[PDB]
């Protein structure tokens, strides 16, 4: 999903 991959911990 590159930029839309989960950005949280």
């Amino acid at each position, epitope marked *: *999903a*590159n*930029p*839309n*991959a*989960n*950005p*949280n*911990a």
Partner: antibody, heavy 123, light 108 residues
């Protein structure tokens, strides 16, 4: 008090730079990806930048690439937007925005928004 | 991905059932959020993942749709529901784009 508070807005002359701050409180800031989203007067919302919870990945809209830098200080719970080469079409309210917590491979919607700080690019 | 909302404006009365439409230019599966915004304030998240109701949001709001066509329904319009409504995609590899918004105003 789960909130985001932006500061650092004001009048800036075209070509000059500006740093926006966003103070987060009431939640575990350093576990959240964060965004900036802007809204020009009379128009809709435009995504600007994303930063991973740890600062390890950053992405920007084409309209601001190479001019805007997003960063964060996780020990002080602040998000930053460094804007250089500001132009007239950057004139907008700037919101710092938290992504809704999700487990899994995918990021989520925008669940927490600051009050917004106005940036006006005028000579 | 470009998002388009219709109508740009619409006039409704308290107690009306109102449906706002949002269309993606290509499939976004169900990675779609709806927001409410009133003048001078920040947007408020209503619906995420095209149909899931955000925690504080009253049950008269709902959403449905997948792929390229999505709708936000207010089952019974109430006085504080007059506002601008935005849809927004967060599909994989698609970054984040918003519709131009649908303003709901008071019919008289």
């Amino acid at each position: 008090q789960v909130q985001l508070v932006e500061s650092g807005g004001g009048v800036v002359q075209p070509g000059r730079s500006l740093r926006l701050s966003c103070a987060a409180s009431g939640f575990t800031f350093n576990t959240y990806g964060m965004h900036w989203v802007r809204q020009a007067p009379g128009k809709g919302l435009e995504w600007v930048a994303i930063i991973w919870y740890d600062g390890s990945q950053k992405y920007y809209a084409d309209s601001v690439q190479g001019r805007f830098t997003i960063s964060r200080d996780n020990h002080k719970n602040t998000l930053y937007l460094q804007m250089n080469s500001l132009r007239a079409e950057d004139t907008a309210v700037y919101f710092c925005v938290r992504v809704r917590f999700s487990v899994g491979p995918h990021g989520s919607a925008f669940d927490l928004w600051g009050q917004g700080t106005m940036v006006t690019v005028s000579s | 991905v470009q998002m388009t909302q219709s109508p740009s404006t619409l006039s409704a009365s308290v107690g009306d059932r109102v449906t706002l439409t949002c269309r993606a230019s290509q499939s976004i599966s169900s990675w779609l959020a709806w927001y409410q915004q009133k003048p001078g304030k920040a947007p408020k998240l209503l619906i995420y993942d095209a149909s899931s109701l955000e925690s504080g949001v009253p049950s008269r709001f709902s959403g449905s749709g997948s792929g390229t066509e999505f709708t936000l329904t207010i089952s019974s319009l109430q006085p504080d529901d007059f506002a601008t409504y935005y849809c927004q995609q967060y599909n994989s590899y698609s970054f984040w784009t918003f519709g131009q918004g649908t303003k709901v105003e008071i019919k008289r």
